[model samples]
Target chain A: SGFRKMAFPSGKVEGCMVQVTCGTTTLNGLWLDDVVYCPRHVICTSEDMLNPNYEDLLIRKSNHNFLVQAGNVQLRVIGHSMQNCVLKLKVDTANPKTPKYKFVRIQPGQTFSVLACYNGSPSGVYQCAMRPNFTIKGSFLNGSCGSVGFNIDYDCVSFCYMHHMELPTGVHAGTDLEGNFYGPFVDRQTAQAAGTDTTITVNVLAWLYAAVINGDRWFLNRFTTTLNDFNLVAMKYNYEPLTQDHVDILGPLSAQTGIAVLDMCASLKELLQNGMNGRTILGSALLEDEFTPFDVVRQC
Target chain B: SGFRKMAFPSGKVEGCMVQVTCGTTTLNGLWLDDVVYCPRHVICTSEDMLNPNYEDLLIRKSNHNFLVQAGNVQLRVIGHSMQNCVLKLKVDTANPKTPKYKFVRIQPGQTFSVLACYNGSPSGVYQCAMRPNFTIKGSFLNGSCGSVGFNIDYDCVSFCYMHHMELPTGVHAGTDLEGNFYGPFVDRQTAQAAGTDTTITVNVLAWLYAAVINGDRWFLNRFTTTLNDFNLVAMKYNYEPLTQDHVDILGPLSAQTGIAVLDMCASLKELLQNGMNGRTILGSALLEDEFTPFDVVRQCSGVTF
Candidate 1:
């Protein structure tokens, strides 16, 4: 992520000087008339006085110089200056120590856009210091100014901070009194598929067999489908059932609606109880795989 | 203030004796018996299983045994047969050297109670002692039982120990702007008759004069008829009000029909606030007289009783 280049108008302003201060010392100022082209936007003015020519003035300022450079990351600085003579920019970064870029010199009497890229984790406070030598005379002068800071919008980034999880295998299992595997299938399709097999193997067993016969990927696809089906049923069971009065009230409005209000209420109740008790129930595999159970719980 | 003597049946029970010896020495045998009674329902059960009685009994027994003579103020020796049976009773007086009553006796089977009435004020814990006489029989020959001790039901006598206040003079000069002579009026009729006479030379400005003269005692009795009208009003104002709906909802109920619910609520609120503030409004005439101005301000500030 990078941002487009920004531009400023070229003009000369009187009594203006470019100031660049770093590490408690001020660099030499470039007089506006002595050198080059000055942009209209870059020219500073004060409310108490009329606009002056930027060409012949020396600008005195602080440690942060207003210049941008090219880089892999987008850098956006927004800030206010105390007086017309100072300019301040705010930066964000995960590490406050050793900011990414340094101030570089620009061509004299030529119009050029400054560009800079910052690289670091998107957290914590980051600060950039300008060298005193980078000061441009005839721009800004004096030390009676302060800087304003800006924040980085994380939503604009590709990286995310939160995680999620997937379902586990053998979530449903059953056995006969003889210690033999019984049909855990609840639908006609599964019973038809396991037909005439007196001692039925578990569907989970079939899933494992498929994983061994085919590739693990093939087995995963089948397992995922089954798991998805189970999740759908679980979600359905988690719904609440509606009463007859509810039907009388809402059925006329939508015929496709079903009575799952009761299920929903139960699910909500379970979620709240779990949240209050600060309890989490998930196998290691599920947790390891970043599978999030329906977080029916509340956060501290 | 003193309580009137009222008798209630004593629920005392008796038990068989069990003799127990500590090593070689044999203590008295235990034979639990009945409780002793005082004039105003004070009862003490036998601490020693063998003899369940109190100080009054010992006093009577000692007086009978010639340990001390009985009179308006007399000492009666009371003792336990066990070791260390010494009883010391000190009557409290403003001047202890010229004490009202002092007695020392050692009657083996006696316990005592002192009854005395003094004109001057006296308030202190009366001390009682029981000294035991040791012998080769081990002071245990009397019986093989545990030690004997007495308990007092001081409810009847505790009020006598309270500091008494001097009775107020019935007549006092009224401080109202009119400079009237107030009080010495005993009842409502006298108060009203005094109020009617303008040249009586005595200002008998009774409380609730406006209502009292009109004979509306039932309605204004608690407030204006009493000296604490300002405090009562202030306390009432400080209380939160009940909603019309609350009255409507509970007014017709059988249990609440005769209840002064609002007044009770006001009283409860005042009590709770007082507890939290750690300040009690003493029911003293001096305080009532001195704090009238403050109470009036409190009333204006919406304090409620």
Candidate 2:
């Protein structure tokens, strides 16, 4: 026999009257139109069948009904759209007084699912209700709304010794000197022992991750600059040459440090993007004074 | 004729009782044993007048009755001791709504005397009843109370560069540096001429107005210490050689700069005392790798005002 089929739009259910009742006992194999026998018989008989599995045969009441057999109680579906209704069973063993069922609104044609069940409490009463699918009003997106951005020109004088280095040509190949992957040009072990390796290999894998995660191209640029500065400074002093092995370690180090750096960068970026006032650079005077008379010394 | 006399430990008086009514506004003086005329002529007015003066004119009726007119009202003395008796008076002011009379409490066995004119309204009837004087339960001394004492401390920190010549020794006294008095210590003028007699000073002062006022002494101390560190750093870097004229200018400069110093000190003192917090100090890192170190020099130098 053909059933009376009804359809409602994605919004408020238009033409269907729905009623939900909490069951007191197990209700295995009960049909959608089956009359509730009693409170005691409504209790769930199978402890292992506590979950709302769509395929379980013994708990399946009808194509339009999901028979939920909870602690000593079975809640038979009197009437509901089987595919459209989503059931959230929260078995809170910690709080016995709390209700165990929650309902979430879903799109009319979307697949309905359940969240993870809390601690096992078969005796808890189950309750279900509907909620609107619309977004909460006035909620900030990424915690930034109604903000203004302005240019912050911080004229800070920093003191640092400038170092100039000269390296053989072709030694700096395969390295993006200005890009994120520009470090470890020369082998650190070989350079340390022989003291004359030219090429420093810089791994850019971590920079790629930072760019991907933090969505900041400057982070990659900053990483590359720091590596370049470190290499150039090392080369200028003729201390040792960086190597591929050293460069390989850059990925992990950058990945570790980059995560934190990216997080801070993202936070700061968010703050700035959300209209933060310029921060005063205090102690610049101290730093400038401390690094004053930048001395540059060549070979002895 | 002689009248009966009553005596006390201090003095004696004769014909102590007397009576008088309104309408009779004249004064008639009497002496001892005199027959005073009354409405009834048979009863002689023999009351003697005692302690009589210009204000106190005494008259007697019979041997026992006497009246004394003191000032504007006439007072009649009654009974032997005059302790449990009443004194009746009649004044010259005729308007009943404003009877020109007043009564005062007097010690028994003391002579009744009027000290001043009765300037109060007499329309309201007043009855003077003498009862034994009793002491209140507590605090016998009237309006003489002791006060409480408290101890307090005051402090101030001035932020400004002191021009070296402002010292008494005139040897670029480092301590003579004044704090930012009125404006930005190092402006275009001072920054352009870094070595040219430049001075920046800031002063902070804090004091407990009253001990009970409970100003925050701890915060004041911190503020003073912080400012002192700033002052020291600023002075060390901004030190300038001084001339005699510069030395002379130091006092006035100090006086002028002191005003700003005091103002800053007051504001800081108020902020600290009123439990204000959350002030932030930012700085650049000395080591580019690390965050900027917030040292005294940086804290003092970067401040705009």
Candidate 3:
């Protein structure tokens, strides 16, 4: 097996566990069950089975028999739910002194989510020894807040780009980064791959991928950060680093840069087919610290 | 709490691991060691002892007992070689099972780069409880290939801007991300910071840290894999996924995307004065995929300074 690369959720999804509220006596004591998910990425040591079908897939799943106090926020592993694996989280409120195992039966992989509600009155939490080693190959991620809806507005790509990326619209319709296929927006035999020739989602993905793979400059220039009216005093001063004002301007600039670069990548699919490796020229300029502005264009 | 500075060799410095070749027995069964140094970002993490003179720096040296059989490339534990912890990779080749305990004393820090020569007519590869916890926190990226001079040649910012980033030729000269200062291009006390009242390295790290802390676009763009030109054609056509020509092209584009994003961050170190809380905006953008480009910008536009 030469190297098989599988990327992680890369903390793209974060977990926020809430404060536990016990009845009259609020106890934010010891963590009954604080682990939302495992520390992620358990390697598959079976060298022989590490193939195309299985390629170094390190399953990062949720916990079983795990514990928590009354104050834990409903931890939602980020990303499209259908795509990721499940977490067998159980909070046992049965016995305090010697909280032994309790009820519940079958079903896992097909496990979508596990939840615990905030009771009108409250108490402690526990788990069972009777559980499975739920460390599967991929991770399921999402907003962990019990009340926060799917609209935690912040970065555009997280929404827009990723929305199109996960375009739960077309033929095989939607399959998240986790490899779960939520399909058949219509009949695979009849409907347009998500309703045809011009769906924004599929086409957007196809367009971006097609152009980027082509090799060109417009793509690079557009996405890179935009230089703005920043630190003029520092400009004159030369060695003066950033000021908070500079920081503010920089944010919008970078966002703009990302849009520009992507827009460029989108529009110039033509020059891409015959262009030079934009990636190289870029490496030449940035990494080598020896590139001219035109290096990318020149390379292409 | 001030900022720490660590500067890596910047870019244009990429490595790929080559097949470990020994004389006649094409020993292809093992991975000859390979590694790339991280562009410098140091954090002594030891706190308390973290002073301007000497902060929380833990110095771990390499080992003499570390050796491999016939294969393996030299792996570089990228970072401020002088400040990061050390991994004593011991791979003995004598007993075919166990032999020489080996020899040598080391300072992995001053270890910017490492190398091991090939033995003439070689045989098989060997190891002794080899490898570490394997590339962490930051990343120990692979691809430690052959004798090509320092130019894997790909990506934009890897070139152009870093020249400016590494304007390594100036003030406080060089302090890594951990705030460790390494100077004296020529006794600066008597001379000016770069003879021009400038301390670039220290400030560069500070400035970069400032915005990253502010939460927004630059960091988001830097990491997200905007999967384009991927395995979709085969989606409709069902099977045409990947080509050498495609990889050659795809490789640099991503490398470029990475650079473009970082370069933007490096510049416009705008909102840098009296502010920091780097762990937030990032958490914001990432948690709420509902963000807009302007959100990244707007977040920055509203700095806490």
Candidate 4:
């Protein structure tokens, strides 16, 4: 419906300016179209169909002298006859003060996050960095094809963190598939936790080493649940340990635990590191939704 | 060049017939065209540009009572102004008696192999079955897009064989990344060697188990070279063995030997079988071109069934 009932709040247009900076000083909404005044202080506009679409177009500066108003932003071209089509948008700025808001015009494949004041209660505006396949914690209001909306009405600060742990060498001696003990094994666990999302993986070498050398079945057992938060567990073992007892246990256990286990022991070749084909397993675990504690404390 | 100078050798046609098996056989070379007499006994034809193309058209039958002739086969059409175009062919038949040959037309994604009589010297007509990404034995004469030709002058037979060995439970115990012994490890080795092509993969568990338990470093060492013939070797091991003496050696060794080694021992979980990704590593090896003896003799080998 051609910009039909779509009009801004009265007296709000003159309160803000759709600052256009296209090459020449004589700007006429250079990169945009259909800029009309609704009564007075407020200016109304729609996407230009004839022109190329933008991913995220800055229409008003936050610090600009005038107060910006807010209403539901649409990706649809309100002024054109082809009124049915709509586009997407990504807003990546701190929420404006009360009686003030900003609009970001965007296309697909683009990402954005609205950070809120860390001191305030979670306002559910995506705080996690724009990473594909990540578990988003804030509100993601979806509209037509390209329309994206979020809610964040507080002050803001951008931030994130990463965690890693190299297995200790002391009691971390190696062990075969059987109960045989071997000296000093290498192992580690790592995670990249940012805002509301995190990805974790552990090289089970240390655990296996501790399990076999110390005969600590409980030590190896704790990993089954602690690592439950991780998406993948890669294990190390010896060749043909026993007919009845082998690394084969993890295969079915992986299915039940819903954690994919890569039997590194089944391989008879030399050691394998990161570049291994199946090493980089993807994950969709979230910080609050899962069991990853920010502080690295001994759970078991 | 429009079908320029592409005419078949004269007097070769009139000797054979281009059999077309379309419905209601009025026979105008139903599926093929430009069938002119190649001086008799050999009916010569080029791909028809007017009709849809064919992957392989049975131009003549081997037992069709006609003396077929041989000449270089071209994928190009020889009758039209647009003469630069050519098609492919696949010939499948026992090479006809001397003075007789067969031609097959084919498109891409199709495979064909020519088998020679086992009693005679290898005639090199691609004895390996029509398998993808395989080391083809025999002469594969190639031409422009679609044109395929082969050389075979002997009688024929189609055959192949598969070889598999499961590690025994006795001294076939498993070993960890280090030289630690673990009893009764299940393991196996398999190879599929056909006409002139073969693919081999070994689960190093039995060898590792044997090596660790018996302190037979020599047994495991032999595989470094014997398995050198294989494309991939998957090894078993225990958790966190000594850093310096671990399977790490295989990573670089695999590079030098040009074989991939899967560190199955690095896995902490239970045993893993087939269906695991990366288990089906592809290979391109020839039978006579490599070091695999058909006989299961004692090179530290197994007994016959």
Candidate 5:
């Protein structure tokens, strides 16, 4: 028998399970209590029943006991509530003397919100565990109130658009080594003229998705910063390899320019649709500087 | 004896159902097969069991066998698939002779999309039925290919923010009859001088949400048009009452101004949070001209802000 998709409150599909919250699969053995059986997918607990490379399976039900394992393989799990709120196992590593981990509950309707570190801790490298074996490491820096950084491994689509990361010049909207930039500007004239418009367009579309959908101001600020730098380059005002300057003024103007271009044409539907293919047309242009790249943006 | 909330795959609650897909609730009687029993909230369905003003219930599971009746009170239904795709029964009144209604299924991952009318129907008043008793009438006018408009009665939060509507001066960002506008600017000086910044800020935030979330250019254009009109008014270069002019140049620039203000301080979280309270801080400043008002936007400071 081949692998069958896991069933949920929504519906069931015929495929493999990428992640399980808490369920057990015994190899050709008697089905145990709380056993997640894929009647249409994985009938038997045999290795032949495990479908390779099925889409990620995100189980939100919390009542399932801590016992999600497929045969001998342990699956990465994200135990969420009915409201899609993630159950974070917050690790308090500040007090080294008595560090503790606690299960924090988020309110309903507040899914995908930035989590503030324990007791107003300063922004720095922090670690939070999701399950027993699954641990996530990232920065908790947002503003005066530090936030839990992104975990790009699981849901890059949501995390990439929700959190904002500072990227360098020619990076956020820069051309790659292939003499090509991110985005859909197959318009020969526009692509051929590759200097500024191409870069700005990607940032504009990116800003729209992040700021609009998630209401993320951090991303908006990052977009503003990128636009200002690109405007300076367009003006041909550069320093000796290593340089900077001219803030605030260009941000507002450039943002408006990008918005106008987007409004005039560019389909929002297509842009998001392209996101499914990881072709949102945005990229990071790194020079001498460095920064952690957004898995999606970096791919672009 | 109070109304119990409807249950679904996500979870259940203790409240009245606003809208149901299709299920039957027999009052103080035996629950038949496919009977959606609200064991926790509403039990033994009766007038006493129906909660007066509980939140709207949007059921997406479509296997309930067309019988969502609450005793004698019929409820609205939105039959959808597991992936949140709505089951729309399209009505083709175009041909007149063979005006028929057909159930159109939306694919997975395509929730909240604009439905284009059949065979390139020009943008105008179009009708689409969600169920036999529930009919929605709206304009299918987006671009060259007409689209299904907003059904404000059920979910204004999603529709209001998703669809873009053309608003006029003293409107989209205008003050209401109470000498106040939409948005959070309790800051004395900002509110005191009822002029450009206030109006522009609203449009800016509104634009950001619409464009960024739904990838809506129509909203962006509407916002641009409003900003230009306000900018012209700010310059005090006004013509006689019934008139208009000047475009394009101001949109990009004003959009930048509003965005800077948002990026600098105003939280997108708070803006949307305010949306939950029907306080997104945007309004319509309808000059002498007119258009259908967005229920949420019009609530700011009161009618005609």
Candidate 6:
């Protein structure tokens, strides 16, 4: 009956870094360095989580201190090294003679990771090179496990992963058939009447899987206007037609658009890249989200 | 220092699962998995690979695991989560539902070898199918292979277009001091008589060098020849024209004989195909440390008798 109050001015989730929050009352927002803090319940401090200079640890901003945290395998110089320093990461120091330094020590302000890398890790991003001392540094952030929550939105890690996946309950992740709230924006204060107090969990297949694994286009146009207001309240409870096991529960995490929605342009897809949580469990594409013509709801 | 004990006896290897072995005896053939025990090795058992599975601090299973069938090759695994585990390839009464013949992920005394064998309806495929996720009754062991240890036989499917390319032994082509090297015939009983010209030119240069790099001319048809019956043995010694980067180092006295033409014979004339080893490799002079020269003297001087 409680959790759902959000707003972070241009703390923009759609526009990365979303920073801030500590509520039960010290709440006021705007972060991502446009700065405006407030936090009564606790979002930052222990000296803004030991200084990688305020990309603010769960606290954030040095542009969020030099990032390039990649993974599918890995190749790191890793984030937040605003400098406790001992850094010498070379990953083949620009190639002359077979160089590979990697020396990491953190503590100046902690946070420095390193995975080195191989092929399918495709782009271990930040095409790297840094020396942590005697001048030489770099930055590039973009490899995945959702690329450090896509450019900093760490304070209470995406609302404690939306409060440990309980989600703004209109019956556990928006209706597979609960008290049929057919939701799209039921809590975080009904998505703050559209300007932002943020919200995407009134459950219906759990915010359509967080707008298909955080590829939110205004949360998929607010889930296609909450699926046309649940087909305009379908004569009091019927508009529920989407199966191939409901588009194979978005298996392989985002079936590269295997299309089961059948309509709504096979249901909104403007963005969804960055390994989609490792394309939901390492792909096998048993295909058949075609498991057969579930009832019917073909798009228009 | 011990190593070399081989005998897939015919269990299979052409399809592939080749891991390793050792010995003092000699007979030959070949095959996977962390259960390999012999050969180079295997026992890995993947928990994502390397180690993990003290079996939840408890383990058991034995009854010789499961064998049932595969003496000739429709392929079979049976089932054994373990006593040693490693036998998966289901897609037709066989199961794994559809992970596409594994190519990876198989443990329990490991062994999965079925390299390429598609001929009828394998169009759109990534199939290594079997059908059990719990007694759904599995079965899918179709066959087709252009490669896998070439010329395979012993049940992994007919596979004998040339079986290790043996025939230059038309008795002894020319003479032998280890250096006499000659062949358009004149000795060893003018090359052990077998014709439409010497066992259709020695089993048509042994199924055109095992169907050229084992995918039957993937048109990489670069097999050439030129035999005027060896015109006094290629001008008395010093032969060529099995062209496009030649190599026919036949054993026992220089052998790259039987040539007259194939110069990709017009880029292999639009990649020909009519089988029976492409008509005994299109009949004639086909040698290749690898080549696909099917000169089919029109299916061997037009056979009809």
User: Distance (Å) between predicted and true CA of B34, model 4?
Assistant: 21
- Lowest-sum lDDT 10-residue window in model 2 chain A: A291-300
Q: Between 1 and 5, whose DockQ is larger? A: 5
lDDT of 1 by residue, A58-162 (tens): 244321443311123332223223222222333332212221221222211111211110111010011111111111111111221111111112111111000
DockQ of each: 0.00, 0.01, 0.02, 0.01, 0.02, 0.01
DockQ for model 5 equals 0.02
lDDT of 3 by residue, A103-128 (tens): 12211111111111122111101110
Q: Could you give candidate 5's per-residue lDDT for residues B140-201 as a string of tens digits? A: 22121112222222211122111111121111111111212223212121222223321122
> What's the residue-level lDDT of A250 in candidate 5?
24
Ranking of all candidate structures by their TM-score, best first? 3, 5, 6, 4, 2, 1
Each predicted model: what fraction of the native A–B Cα contacts (within 8 Å) does it retain?
Answer: 0.00, 0.03, 0.00, 0.00, 0.04, 0.00
Candidate 4 per-residue C-alpha lDDT over A62-110 given as tens digits, one digit per residue, 9 for 90 to 100: 2222221222221222221111121111122222322233343321111
By lDDT: ranked, best first: 5, 3, 6, 2, 4, 1
TM-score of chain B, candidates 1 onward in order = 0.17, 0.12, 0.17, 0.21, 0.18, 0.19
Q: Please report, as a residue range, the 10-residue window in candidate 3 chain A with the lowest summed lDDT.
A: A122-131
Query: Across residues A1-300, which tens digit of lDDT does each residue of candidate 2 receive?
Result: 000000101001000011222332221111112321111111223342234233242244432333433333444443322221122222212222221222222211111111101111100000111111111111011101101100101211111100011123211111111111112322111231112322111212222332233233332232223444444554553323344444554444345444433333233233223322323112121111110000000000
Task: Report the lDDT tens digits of candidate 6 across residue range A41-122.
Answer: 1233333332323223334323222222211111222222211111112221121211112212211111111111111121
Clashes of each: 92, 68, 102, 83, 29, 70
Model 3 is docked with a DockQ of 0.02
Q: Each candidate: what lDDT?
A: 0.19, 0.20, 0.21, 0.20, 0.21, 0.21
Candidate 3 or 4, higher DockQ? 3
Candidates' chain A TM-scores? 0.14, 0.16, 0.21, 0.21, 0.18, 0.16
Error of 4 at B6 (Å): 42
